[PDB]
């Protein structure tokens, strides 16, 4: 590991600098290095890891969608070479590599050492997210979908037992699981039901929250609401 010679604290400090500089490839490398030190991650450090790789993979998914669209148009009255397919495959292969890197970190060994709900649910959700990103480009497709489903479901079970309905991690988990149902699993009715009950159960729990926790939860709830508006 190219970050093996750098102090854990220095990697974290530089990941925060990279975030301010919007250098998310650097941020991912720093946080990967931090994870590979072997120590568990704090809540802040976990979110730095999530921020870095979500932005990296986020740019790859956007590029892949553009290229896939151009590729599908080429395969309709369309004039013909292999370049579009080749370059889409290049981005796709790079995207899959990032997803495998994250899944590798969760498997070695973030998840097995995560005992607390906030950490375990966070990592299992992340596992679901990155198997979902793999599913988006897959055509083993079924096993990838099942791996996402299984990760999300284990996370849902723990969050429902151990976290209040308004917990931001639980809310973000349910949001992404509902996206999985709608966009990946061809289960729009499951997606709508999950988003509804997640929103309603959080609504009924807002009265227990501080002003700052209320802002955090309602911000995420609005995404659930926005999706329901698009889905119904």
């Amino acid at each position: 590991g190219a970050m093996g010679s750098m102090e854990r604290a220095s990697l974290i400090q530089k990941a925060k600098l990279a975030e301010q500089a919007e250098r998310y490839e650097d941020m991912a490398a720093f946080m990967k290095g931090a994870v590979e030190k072997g120590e568990e991650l704090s809540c802040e450090e976990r979110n730095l890891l999530s921020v870095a790789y979500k932005n990296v993979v986020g740019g790859q998914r956007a590029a892949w969608r553009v290229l896939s669209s151009i590729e599908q148009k080429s395969n309709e009255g369309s004039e013909e070479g292999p370049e579009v397919r080749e370059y889409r495959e290049k981005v796709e292969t790079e995207l899959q590599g990032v997803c495998d890197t994250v899944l590798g970190l969760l498997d070695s060994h973030l998840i097995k050492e995560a005992g607390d709900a906030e950490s375990r649910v966070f990592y299992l959700k992340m596992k679901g997210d990155y198997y979902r990103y793999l599913a988006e480009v897959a055509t083993d497709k079924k096993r990838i979908i099942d791996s996402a489903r299984s990760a999300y479901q284990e996370a849902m079970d723990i969050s429902k037992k151990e976290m209040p309905p308004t917990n931001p991690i639980r809310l973000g988990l349910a949001l992404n699981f509902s996206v999985f149902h709608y966009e990946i699993a061809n289960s729009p009715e499951e997606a709508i039901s999950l988003a509804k009950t997640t929103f309603d159960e959080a609504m009924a729990d807002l009265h227990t929250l501080s002003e700052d926790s209320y802002k955090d939860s309602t911000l995420i709830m609005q995404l659930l609401r926005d999706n329901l508006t698009l889905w119904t």
Partner: peptide, 9 residues
Amino acid sequence: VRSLSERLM
């Protein structure tokens, strides 16, 4: 149009 997923805190 694609569904909205969790945003970074």
